[PDB]
Write a protein that binds this ligand. Structure first.
Ligand SMILES: OC[C@H]1O[C@@H](O)[C@H](O)[C@@H](O)[C@H]1O
Ligand SMILES: [Ca+2]
Ligand SMILES: [Ca+2]
Length: 857
């Protein structure tokens, strides 16, 4: 039901029909879809299919296939004479779009946004059917991609004379020197005349705080009359003098709305808004990164797009929760490995104050890892002349279209600081690489012309291998205001890059790739396939090309010229289950094989691994950290020489005293005391390393503290002390400041992260359930199967435990805990009410939580 009550751009997610089938031909309006599934977008049709060992480990053993989406809807007669378009933020992949039986075009890339005009084929005042065919033919990805319309879809309805799609670009070239006073904004606006008569228009533009009223504007302008021929467009340039704009920053992410009205006479024809923030950056070859004139270390993570048990679905609350968990770790930046983010993530980062390195491509013109259906099939092909897809430039290759489409979408987003043009473009491919520098220069030229305001970059793993191609490409980046990302350099190679390429501004575009499970303590070693399909939680386990967390951070924190780090990864993701990876078919190890990653600091369910608190101790200057591993039950610890257990403390404290309290005692005994040394770089960054007589001989391991404690039932506890040898007040210190021997599992403890959510059929409530003993201590290895009974105005949409080899259905109402924890994800309906969730487990006390849902005004 499409009419004039809708906003100019309106949500089009509701009430689609879906069918998985590679034989059906369902483009015609009269096709009978009465037996098809009924779904709301966003939607992922891989995540509900069964695991199969004849699929590929790298994409989580889940199939893709051909999916059809249909939606029949009325276009009211009050929209006659208006322009109508449908906008896709992402469809994975190989979309074909028909409207009322007429093929509109196609779009290969699964991660870039695109649109189609519907006006030409619309039945105004009648029934209409839009149809999307999706062909995710495997193999197409080095990770789990998902399949389908996994991001939001909207409708755009405008007057015949209107601002174009993504039609306003904003530059503040003098912001760094004008800051504090009047700031010049240079705007360019595309105005299209899609009528059959000449138009003469003016623009009224207004900049006012986001969510505020226009009378709080900090600047306005009205332009002179502009003539636009019928069926043509014009670019209208204008200048706004913004009166003392608030800067956008990590701490204070102030946002503005920039509103453009197209006027004919005194009547508004079209109103187009774009979100904006005032900020400037710099990358210096010697001193690194700065935001708004102040030095900032990029403390970043790489993040794949999926949302755990939800699959690829770009649910806004799921994405927001990820960012919130990362911020709590001290993360201030995200690299969207290796593809454009959902706009929802860009929205969140604009609002939260998180810097985004938005990467556009993984491979370029050569497919990777035998994935013959990946984007390397399409990167260099032309766009057919009858393909009416819209979003970016269509005059060269798909790569240019997809790159400019992404830049057009996000060019005004203050959170985005760099455009990353590729990742390890020469890794895992066949043929010569001699043409790759020329491809790189072409991408750099396109980017610089599409957006002069931000550096372009890439993530190159051949700089450490001294490939001449990397020298050429890095110089070409540098010659165009770009910044060079090196993948998996160590301290010595950072120094070699600085010596060999003194003109480059560099950063660690991908680092670490430590591999750990959550809650595994009976060995401190890893880096390879184990006997239990899990990996140690100690930070001693990494892939051969990577480095443990303390090593990759130690090498970055010391060097002001390494602007920052993008740790692989912030969250575990589906697929790439290294060291159980497989780029071909077949189970890796005994089935069920590990099907999600072990790289994440946080698991797929949002539950942090122990190294989360090492990073928090290093990165979060707004909280204190005091965290002990391992959990202190005899059957989970590792007994080495002398039956001693290695005890690790992550903390930002200056000094720690370790204690032991035997079970049944209330009196603790001092067992150790260690003090950090404070280091300061030339730029003023600080960090702590242990330099005591029993320090580790491997320097980077001294960014934390280790004791060897004999096993005995009781409690290990730690006290934090500051530089003055005074006790640190409890406050809001995070982590396990003590570990203690538990009893047997007795009860469940369920808690919803948000007790009230929006009744829009989108918002989510995340319910963590712990298996604990009778005194509330989590049983560290508990794997009890927990069943969720969801009643009321909501639906269970996912269950998760983060365990890589668990093939139980994400859509079941039950799942085993892993390392004491399990997750349920409930979604609201479109009616306000109450959701009651009861978590049950055999032999244990149940736990019930209640969640209110609130109607949309
Ligand atoms: O360690 C695994 C990672 O290795 C990197 O070299 C690659 O860019 C990532 O996408 C991921 O595969
Ligand atoms: Ca493959
Ligand atoms: Ca801190």
């Amino acid at each position: 039901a499409v009419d004039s009550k809708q906003n100019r751009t309106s949500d089009f997610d509701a009430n689609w029909k879906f069918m998985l089938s590679d034989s059906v031909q369902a483009q015609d309006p009269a096709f009978d879809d009465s037996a098809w599934q009924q779904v709301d977008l966003p939607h992922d049709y891989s995540i509900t299919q069964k695991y199969s060992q004849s699929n590929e480990a790298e994409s989580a053993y889940l199939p893709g296939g051909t999916g059809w989406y249909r939606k029949s809807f009325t276009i009211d007669r009050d929209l006659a004479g208006k322009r109508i378009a449908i906008n896709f933020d992402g469809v994975y992949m190989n979309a074909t779009v028909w409207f009322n039986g007429v093929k509109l075009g196609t779009h290969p890339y699964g991660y870039s946004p695109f649109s189609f005009d519907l006006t030409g084929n619309a039945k105004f005042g009648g029934e209409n059917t839009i149809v999307v065919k999706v062909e995710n033919r495997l193999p197409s990805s080095r990770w789990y991609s998902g399949s389908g319309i996994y991001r939001d879809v909207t409708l755009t309805v405008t007057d015949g004379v209107h601002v174009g799609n993504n039609g306003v670009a904003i530059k503040t070239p003098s912001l760094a020197t004008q800051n504090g006073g009047d700031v010049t904004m240079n705007l360019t606006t595309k105005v299209a005349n899609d009528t059959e008569a000449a138009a003469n228009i003016t623009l009224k533009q207004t900049v006012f705080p986001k969510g505020g009223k226009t009378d709080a504007a900090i600047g306005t302008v009205t332009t002179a009359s502009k003539s636009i021929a019928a069926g043509a467009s014009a670019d209208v340039t204008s200048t706004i003098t913004a009166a003392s704009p608030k800067l956008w920053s990590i701490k204070n992410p102030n946002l503005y709305t920039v509103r453009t009205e197209v006027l004919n006479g005194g009547k508004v024809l079209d109103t187009y808004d774009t979100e904006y923030g005032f900020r400037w950056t710099g990358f210096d070859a010697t001193s690194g990164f700065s935001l708004n004139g102040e030095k900032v270390k990029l403390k970043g993570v790489s993040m794949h797009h999926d949302q755990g048990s939800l699959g690829a679905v770009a649910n806004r609350r799921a994405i927001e929760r990820q960012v919130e968990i990362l911020q709590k770790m001290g993360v201030n930046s995200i690299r969207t490995t290796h593809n454009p983010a959902a706009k929802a993530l860009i929205d969140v980062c604009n609002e939260k104050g998180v810097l985004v390195v938005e990467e556009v491509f993984d491979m370029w013109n050569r497919s990777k890892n035998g994935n013959t259906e990946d984007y390397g099939k399409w990167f260099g092909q032309a766009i057919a002349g009858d393909n009416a897809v819209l979003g970016g430039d269509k005059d060269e290759t798909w790569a240019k279209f997809d790159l400019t489409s992404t830049i057009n979408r996000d060019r005004n987003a203050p959170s985005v600081i760099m455009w990353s043009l590729g990742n390890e473009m020469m890794e895992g491919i066949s043929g010569s690489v001699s043409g790759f520098p020329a491809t790189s220069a072409k991408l750099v030229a396109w980017t610089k012309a599409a957006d002069s305001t931000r550096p372009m970059t890439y993530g190159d793993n051949k700089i450490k291998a001294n490939w001449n191609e990397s020298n050429t490409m890095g110089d070409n980046l540098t010659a165009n205001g770009g910044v060079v990302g090196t993948n998996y350099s160590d301290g010595a190679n950072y120094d070699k890059i600085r010596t060999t390429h003194p003109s480059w501004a560099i950063y660690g575009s991908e680092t670490a790739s430590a591999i750990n499970s959550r809650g595994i303590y009976n060995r401190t070693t890893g880096g390879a396939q184990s006997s239990d399909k899990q990996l140690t939680s100690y930070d001693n386990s990494a892939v051969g090309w990577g480095a443990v967390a303390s090593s990759a951070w130690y090498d970055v924190v010391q060097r002001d010229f390494v602007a920052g780090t993008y740790v692989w990864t912030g969250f575990d993701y589906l697929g790439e289950p290294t060291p159980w990876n497989g780029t071909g078919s077949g189970a890796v190890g005994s089935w069920p094989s590990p099907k999600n990653s072990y790289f994440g600091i946080v698991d797929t369910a949002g539950f942090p691994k122990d190294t989360y608190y090492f990073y928090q101790s290093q990165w979060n200057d707004d909280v204190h950290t005091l965290h002990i591993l391992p959990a202190w039950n005899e059957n989970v610890v590792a007994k080495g020489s002398g039956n001693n257990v290695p005890v690790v403390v992550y903390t930002d404290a200056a000094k720690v005293k370790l204690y032991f309290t035997p079970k049944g005692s209330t009196e603790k005994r001092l067992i150790g005391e260690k003090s950090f040394t404070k280091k300061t770089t030339a730029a003023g960054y600080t960090y702590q390393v242990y330099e005591g007589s029993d320090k580790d001989s491997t320097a980077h391991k001294n960014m934390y503290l280790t004791w060897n404690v004999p096993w005995a039932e009781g409690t290990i506890s730690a006290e934090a002390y500051d530089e003055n040898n005074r006790l640190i007040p409890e406050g809001s210190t995070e982590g396990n400041a003590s570990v203690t021997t538990t009893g047997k599992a007795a009860k469940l403890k369920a808690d919803a992260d948000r007790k009230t959510i929006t009744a829009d059929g989108k918002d989510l409530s995340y319910i963590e359930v712990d298996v604990t003993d009778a005194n509330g201590h989590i049983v560290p290895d508990a794997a009890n199967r927990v069943t969720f009974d969801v009643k009321g105005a909501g639906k269970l949409v996912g269950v998760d435990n983060g365990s890589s080899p668990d093939h139980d259905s994400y859509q079941a109402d039950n799942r085993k805990a892993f390392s004491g924890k399990v997750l349920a994800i409930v979604q609201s309906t479109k009616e306000a009410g109450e959701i009651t969730v009861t978590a049950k487990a055999d032999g244990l006390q149940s736990s019930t939580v209640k969640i209110a849902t609130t109607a949309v005004p």
